[PDB]
């Protein structure tokens, strides 16, 4: 089939975690799959980014209350006709 | 000469009973990937989609 073929014919953005999980299930006897679980949890988070979303929600929740805002090397936004202006 | 011809039939039925218990245990027994799916190509491992492929994708 078209298992892990990308838009450009290469590999998906989550092919490595899936191939790791299929290594896990290839060497695992059935009903011993409970040791195989962490590769799976890594794969589902590669697909949907759920734990990353919850973590960035908590970081933004602590960030958004403060009156100081930001004391860090900032992230500067530019317009598209000025990528390499300066 | 009749108790013996009963022992024969009761052995012939206990054999069928043990035959059933076996063949009902042999169903629920888990099966290899090479018996259950594609006999050759026995690995589940992909290497799927190799034209624009990147070194460091295996794990």
**Annotated domain spans of chain A:** 1-86
How far away is chain A from the Cα of B42, in angstroms, using its nearest Cα?
A: 9
Rg (CA), chain B: 25
Tokens of A30: 């059935």
Residue A20 main-chain phi, psi, to 5 deg: -65, -45
User: Which of chain A's residues have a Cβ under 8 Å away from the Cβ of B29?
Assistant: none
User: Residues with Cβ < 8 Å from A8, sequence gap 6 or more?
Assistant: B51, B52
Count CB atoms within 10 A of the CB of residue A33.
12
Q: How was this structure determined?
A: cryo-EM
What's the number of CA atoms in the CB half-sphere (13 Å) around residue B8?
5
The answer to whether the CB atoms of B59 and A17 lie below 8 A apart is yes
Residue A46 main-chain phi, psi, to 5 deg: -65, -40
Which residues 1-59 on chain B approach chain A with CB closer than 8 angstroms? Answer: 30, 33, 43-54, 56-59
């Amino acid at each position: 089939t078209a298992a892990g073929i990308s838009l450009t014919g290469g590999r998906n953005r989550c092919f490595s975690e899936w191939q790791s999980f299929m290594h896990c299930t290839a060497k695992t006897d059935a009903k011993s799959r409970a040791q195989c679980l962490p590769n799976f949890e890594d794969y589902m988070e590669c697909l949907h980014h759920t734990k990353e979303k919850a973590r960035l929600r908590e970081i933004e929740s602590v960030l958004k209350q403060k009156k100081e805002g930001l004391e860090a090397p900032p992230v500067k936004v530019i317009p598209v006709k000025a990528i390499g202006l300066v | 000469d009749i108790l013996n011809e009963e022992a024969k039939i009761v052995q012939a039925l206990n054999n069928q009973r043990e035959l059933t218990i076996k063949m009902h245990e042999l169903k629920r027994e888990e099966k290899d990937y090479a018996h259950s799916y594609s006999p050759l190509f026995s690995d589940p491992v992909p290497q799927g989609g190799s034209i624009g492929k990147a070194p460091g994708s295996s794990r």
